[PDB]
Design a protein around this ligand. Structure first.
Ligand SMILES: *[C@@H](O)[C@H](CCCC)NC(=O)[C@H](CC(C)C)NC(=O)OCc1ccccc1
Length: 220
C-alpha cells in the first residue's frame, strides 16, 4: 500500500464540525464516511445531517446523545432509504423527534463493511476505499489538550473505545522515539481542538487506542 494517503486532497472530506455537548460522535463519524463514499460515487461533496441520525436511528440501536454506533447509522440510511443534507436538517446538539423528509435526502447506502480488527487491514481500506469510520479510546486528558505531533497515550485501551471519529489518511513524520507513523483522524470537536480539528494518532503501535477494533464504511 502507499506510505502516505490523504483523502482531503482528493475532495472526499467536509470541514471539521462540532458535536457540542451531546454524545453524538458516532453520527459525525458516520456522516463523514458516507460523505466520502457519496463523493466517490457522484463526484459531489454534500455535508450530511447528524441530527437526522441522532433523532431517527433509534430503531437500528442508536441512543441519540447517549451514544450509538456508526454501523447502526449505516443500517438506518439503508433501511430508511435516505439521509437528509446538513443544510436541510441542521445540527442542534440535542435529541428531538424525527423530522426526516425524503424530498431533501442526498445520500443512500446499501449496507456497510466491517474491517478485520488489524491495522494492516485498516491501512488497506484507507488506501483503497476512502475515509473510514473508527472507534477510539479518547478518554484521557492528553487527548483533550492535543495540539501537534503524533498522539500516543500509554494508558490507552485497545478494547474499550468511547469515541467515534474518521480516518481520512495516514502518513509519517520523523520523531524522537522513531515511532513515526500515524493515522490522520478527523474529530468532531471543532477546529479549535488539535490541529485544525485533526489529530495524528499513533499507527502500527499495537492498535493504539483501539483504532482498528471497530472500523467500517458504508457501501454506496
Ligand atoms: C461520543 O460522542 C459518544 C459519547 C457517548 C456517551 C455520552 N461515544 C459513543 O457513542 C461510543 C462510540 C463507539 C465506541 C463507536 N459508543 C457508545 O457510547 O456506545 C454506548 C452504546 C452502545 C450501543 C448502543 C447504544 C449506546
Amino acid at each position: 500500500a502507499p506510505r502516505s494517503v490523504d483523502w482531503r486532497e482528493k475532495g472526499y472530506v467536509t470541514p471539521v464540525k462540532n458535536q457540542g455537548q451531546c454524545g453524538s460522535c458516532w453520527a459525525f463519524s458516520a456522516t463523514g464516511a458516507l460523505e466520502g463514499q457519496m463523493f466517490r460515487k457522484t463526484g459531489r461533496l454534500i455535508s450530511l445531517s447528524e441530527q437526522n441520525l441522532v433523532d431517527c436511528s433509534g430503531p437500528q440501536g442508536n441512543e441519540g446523545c447517549n451514544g450509538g454506533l456508526m454501523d447502526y447509522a449505516f443500517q438506518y440510511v439503508q433501511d430508511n432509504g435516505g439521509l437528509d443534507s446538513e443544510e436541510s436538517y441542521p445540527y442542534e446538539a440535542t435529541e428531538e423527534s424525527c423530522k426526516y423528509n425524503p424530498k431533501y435526502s442526498v445520500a443512500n447506502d446499501a449496507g456497510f463493511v466491517d474491517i478485520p480488527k488489524q491495522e494492516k487491514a485498516l491501512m488497506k481500506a484507507v488506501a483503497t476505499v476512502g475515509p473510514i469510520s473508527v472507534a477510539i479510546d479518547a478518554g484521557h486528558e492528553s487527548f483533550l489538550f492535543y495540539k501537534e505531533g503524533i498522539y500516543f497515550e500509554p494508558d490507552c485501551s485497545s478494547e474499550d473505545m468511547d469515541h467515534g471519529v474518521l480516518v481520512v489518511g495516514y502518513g509519517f513524520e520523523s520523531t524522537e522515539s522513531d515511532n513515526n507513523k500515524y493515522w490522520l483522524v478527523k474529530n468532531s470537536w471543532g477546529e479549535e481542538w488539535g490541529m485544525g480539528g485533526y489529530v495524528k494518532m499513533a499507527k502500527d503501535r499495537r492498535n493504539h487506542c483501539g483504532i482498528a477494533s471497530a472500523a467500517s464504511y458504508p457501501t454506496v
